[PDB]
Design a protein around this ligand. Structure first.
Ligand SMILES: CCCCCCCCCCCCCCCCCC(=O)OC[C@H](COP(=O)([O-])OCC(O)COP(=O)([O-])OC[C@@H](COC(=O)CCCCCCCCCCCCCCCCC)OC(=O)CCCCCCCCCCCCCCCCC)OC(=O)CCCCCCCCCCCCCCCCC
Ligand SMILES: CCCCCCCCCCCCCCCCCC(=O)OC[C@H](COP(=O)([O-])OCC(O)COP(=O)([O-])OC[C@@H](COC(=O)CCCCCCCCCCCCCCCCC)OC(=O)CCCCCCCCCCCCCCCCC)OC(=O)CCCCCCCCCCCCCCCCC
Ligand SMILES: CCCCCCCCCCCCCCCCC[C@@H](O)O[C@H](CO[C@H](O)CCCCCCCCCCCCCCC)COP(=O)(O)OCC[N+](C)(C)C
Ligand SMILES: CCCCCCCC/C=C\CCCCCCCC(=O)O[C@H](COC(=O)CCCCCCC/C=C/CCCCCCCC)COP(=O)(O)OCCN
Lengths: 459, 57
């Protein structure tokens, strides 16, 4: 596993000793090479995980997430260099350093064998994101956003830490293999109920669960483009992955402790999809769409079935790619017109045809068109939910409708109609932007040919 | 025939020969509690290191 970690660490002195006009080229090339190397973790076993050492291990759940992280770094670098051109050399290197440190923390987080190490890296991911949002965000709200991003996370994660150390006092270990092999049922007691809540609520906040989600619209809207890309594509999944690891010690308590969270997820999925229908800010719409998809992921993890776990893994990967692409698409128009109001710039298909094609494909994957992996995950989760209770289809189907209704709505508002007359500074699409869209969209489509590679351990 | 003792003589520490047996436990002491046993053996390195949470040393 060090064959991934050490090159990522070497990215830091490489960017700090590069020429002033070579930082982007070097960082992009070497992050792409690191992604190519990380692509070898996809060879998984079935029976058990790849246990490299006492500290790091790779699973069929971890490997797609690691590949997505390593692939997302070069895309973030490509998307950042446009609006950071006027920046000084030192601050550009500091921005790249924040991105590299975030990738390093995420890579170590997804492969830690022991739950305290996972928790420490899980919290360590906070600091670079906070610095990125509050230093390179554009508006005055970013500061408030940063605070919301911070104290929502910590207020959830501080109890988890306590629970974790408590567990190691009674079990004797926090190694995940030992935890899984020596797992014992949780009795029906108040102490067990509160330990369950302490083990779950941090990942709930990270998802975010409906009702604990107010930090996400602020943080994703106010962040720079690379911040939004990493926040939506990878950071949210830190919750899901965490849940998939920690529910192994929460049975059979989850059989009834999950009812309020399931109700919140289903109803708030309806609520956030409906919120997307009346949204004036284009980034806010994408953020709320992420909330709805993550609610579906929460339902999948809470019902604890192999089909639901497979669907949750697939949906996590697919949503990461799609939401990153949508954020980049919105940022292109924002850099055109310096406003996030969705109705300001209209009829853009007339002026930017290829970018309109990119918009269309992103909207199609957002509404889960078959046979995309978005629908693969969604359908697996819906089938598992139907087995859990047949009435769930009523909500699930409703969500589907609303999702399409807002997706095309976005597409119709920004691409169709007539162009705004007074906006006359809409330049042709750069090769950088088109390449970024392609590098988002093509892996997503290729994953359809080999879906099992993202279906997780339960496959 | 009584000679007055010189200066410094009555303050001497002297010896006494007695048939009285020397008392064994004049303080009436109880039996002293047994001490903690001892430390013994050779010092081996700690098994699997410190065994702190994730540290392998
Ligand atoms: C089904 C037909 C099979 C054909 C066989 C060959 C197909 C080769 C396609 C390769 C993948 C395309 C690459 C994606 C990015 C596009 C690149 C681009 O910029 O184009 C510019 C290029 C240059 O034109 P230009 O004049 O310079 O300017 C273009 C303007 O931008 C304006 O351009 P535009 O307005 O003309 O639009 C461009 C085009 C491109 O934009 C798109 O939307 C295409 C992307 C498809 C939708 C993706 C998300 C939805 C989820 C589906 C996931 C499918 C993945 C399958 C595996 C993919 C492997 C990579 O959009 C459309 O034409 C309308 C799209 C509606 C298609 C609806 C598909 C529904 C399902 C169909 C079947 C899927 C499963 C097949 C097997 C099932 C059982 C037999 O234009 C083209 O060449 C057109 C692209 C070809 C159309 C593809 C439509 C169907 C293919 C879907 C995937 C192929 C599956 C192959 C398996 C065997 C079957
Ligand atoms: C010049 C290079 C050189 O001569 O290095 C020779 C030296 C020879 O290593 P070796 O004993 O043959 O290989 C043992 C393996 O590393 C096998 O590893 P090990 O079992 O010897 O591991 C030693 C142990 C103890 O090692 C440490 O505690 C320090 C390791 C660095 C911690 C990570 C942050 C610094 C980077 O590492 C751990 O306990 C893993 C926990 C690491 C996280 C510690 C808490 C911070 C987490 C992030 C916040 O290799 C290195 O020094 C690698 C660079 C350090
Ligand atoms: C904005 C979104 C935030 C996230 C929301 C998280 C939701 C967490 C809610 C937890 C769900 C259930 C918690 C505990 C399970 C049962 C709770 C209780 O109501 O059930 C009855 C419990 O009996 C009584 O009702 C006692 C509970 C009443 C006192 C608690 C106050 C509840 C008022 C609502 C407070 C709001 C909570 C959220 C604050 C933000 C069952 O009776 P009984 O089977 O005999 O006892 C079972 C427990 N035993 C086995 C240990 C004995
Ligand atoms: C974004 C906001 C998220 C907020 C999350 C807050 C909820 C976190 C869950 C509770 C946190 C503390 C729980 C402690 C960790 C559990 C470990 C444990 O097992 O200890 C229990 C002890 O459990 C407790 O003492 C916890 C009682 C609560 C103390 C603090 C109260 C705070 C408010 C309570 C309700 C809020 C918690 C749920 C909120 C949901 C999220 C909004 C049993 O240990 P023993 O003493 O040895 O007993 C064994 C014999 N029965």
């Amino acid at each position: 596993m060090l064959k991934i970690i050490i090159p990522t660490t070497m990215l830091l002195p490489m960017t700090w000793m590069s020429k002033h006009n070579m930082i982007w080229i070097n960082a992009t090339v070497h992050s792409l090479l690191i992604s190519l190397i990380s692509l070898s973790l996809l060879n998984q076993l079935g029976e058990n995980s790849l246990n490299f050492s006492l500290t790091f291990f790779s699973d069929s759940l971890s490997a797609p997430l690691l590949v997505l992280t390593t692939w997302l770094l070069p895309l973030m670098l490509m998307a950042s260099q446009s609006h950071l051109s006027k920046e000084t050399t030192t601050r550009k290197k500091l921005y790249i350093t924040m991105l590299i440190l975030l990738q390093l923390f995420l890579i170590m987080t997804f492969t830690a064998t022991e739950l305290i190490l996972f928790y420490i890296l899980f919290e360590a991911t906070l600091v670079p994101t906070l610095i990125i949002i509050t230093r390179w965000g554009n508006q005055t709200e970013r500061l408030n956003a940063g605070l919301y991003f911070l104290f929502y996370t910590l207020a959830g994660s501080l109890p988890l830490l306590v629970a974790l150390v408590y567990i190691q006092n009674t079990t004797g270990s926090l190694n995940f293999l030992i935890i899984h092999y020596w797992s014992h049922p949780l009795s029906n007691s108040w102490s067990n109920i509160f330990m369950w809540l302490a083990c779950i609520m941090a990942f709930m906040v990270k998802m975010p669960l409906y009702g604990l989600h107010l930090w996400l619209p602020k943080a994703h809207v106010e962040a720079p483009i690379a911040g939004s890309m990493v926040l939506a594509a990878v950071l949210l999944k830190l919750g899901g992955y965490g849940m998939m690891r920690i529910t192994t010690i929460l049975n059979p308590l989850t059989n009834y402790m999950a009812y309020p969270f399931l109700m919140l997820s289903m109803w708030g999925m309806i609520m956030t999809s409906s919120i997307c229908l009346r949204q004036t800010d284009l980034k806010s719409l994408i953020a709320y769409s992420s909330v709805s998809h993550m609610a579906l992921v929460i339902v999948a993890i809470m019902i604890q079935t192999p089909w639901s776990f497979m669907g949750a893994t697939a949906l996590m990967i697919a949503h990461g790619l799609t939401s990153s692409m949508l954020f980049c698409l919105a940022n292109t128009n924002y850099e055109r017109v310096h406003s996030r109001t969705m109705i300001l710039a209209r009829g853009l298909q007339t002026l930017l045809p290829l970018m309109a094609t990119w918009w269309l494909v992103a909207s199609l994957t957002n509404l889960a068109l078959p046979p995309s992996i978005n629908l693969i995950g969604e359908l697996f989760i819906i089938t598992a939910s139907f087995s859990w209770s047949n009435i769930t289809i009523i909500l699930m189907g409703m969500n589907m409708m609303i999702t399409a209704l807002y997706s095309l709505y976005m597409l119709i508002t920004t691409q169709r109609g007539k162009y705004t007359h007074h906006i006359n500074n809409i330049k042709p699409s750069f090769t950088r932007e088109n390449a970024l869209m392609a590098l988002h969209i093509l892996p997503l489509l290729l994953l359809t040919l080999n879906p099992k590679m993202i279906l997780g351990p339960l496959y | 025939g009584w000679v007055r003792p010189d200066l410094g003589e009555l303050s001497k520490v002297t010896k006494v020969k007695t048939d009285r047996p020397l008392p064994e436990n004049p303080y009436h002491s109880r039996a002293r509690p047994e001490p903690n046993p001892e430390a013994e053996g050779d010092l081996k390195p700690a098994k699997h290191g410190s065994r702190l949470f994730f540290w392998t040393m």
